[PDB]
Amino acid sequence: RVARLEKKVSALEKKVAXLEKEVARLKKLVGE
Amino acid sequence: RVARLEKKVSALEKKVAXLEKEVARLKKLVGE
Amino acid sequence: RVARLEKKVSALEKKVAXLEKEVARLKKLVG
Numbered sequence: 001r002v003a004r005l006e007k008k009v010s011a012l013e014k015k016v017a018x019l020e021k022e023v024a025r026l027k028k029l030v031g032e
Numbered sequence: 033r034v035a036r037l038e039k040k041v042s043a044l045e046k047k048v049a050x051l052e053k054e055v056a057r058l059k060k061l062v063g064e
Numbered sequence: 065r066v067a068r069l070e071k072k073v074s075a076l077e078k079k080v081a082x083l084e085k086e087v088a089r090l091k092k093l094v095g
């Protein structure tokens with residue numbers, strides 16, 4: 001169970017990094 | 033401890049799915 | 065190993081919170 005969780009967490013980390021970059025680019029495109 | 037973590041990771045996987053979908057939609061609307 | 069996972073999961077939760085806020089703002093401006 002812990003090994004499987006470790007792999008799920010690593011996958012999530014890669015996706016969240018990404019979303020952060022994508023969100024930062026969209027914020028620039030839309031502007032303020 | 034591991035069961036509790038599993039629940040948390042499941043909840044995160046759901047939230048990231050979504051964000052991915054929302055971010056794909058916004059990217060299509062902004063273009064580029 | 066479990067404590068290392070717990071730290072990683074806490075970190076992700078704070079990051080997803082956020083992304084949700086930022087995305088909610090973007091959705092409102094573009095919608």
Ligand SMILES: *C(=O)c1ccc(NC(C)=O)cc1
Pocket residue numbers: 001002003004005
């Ligand atoms: C949990 O991810 C887990 C638990 C057991 C094993 N392997 C054994 C039982 O041979 C792998 C991973």
Ligand SMILES: *C(=O)c1ccc(NC(C)=O)cc1
Pocket residue numbers: 046047049050051053
């Ligand atoms: C799409 O946003 C999407 C679709 C299915 C799920 N499933 C979870 C919430 O059980 C999440 C997000």
Ligand SMILES: *C(=O)c1ccc(NC(C)=O)cc1
Pocket residue numbers: 065066067068069
């Ligand atoms: C897991 O994150 C983990 C496992 C073992 C230890 N340390 C002790 C001494 O067993 C720390 C962290």
Ligand SMILES: *C(=O)c1ccc(NC(C)=O)cc1
Pocket residue numbers: 081085
């Ligand atoms: C977002 O959910 C968030 C982050 C920081 C704060 N700080 C205030 C309330 O002290 C509120 C909400």
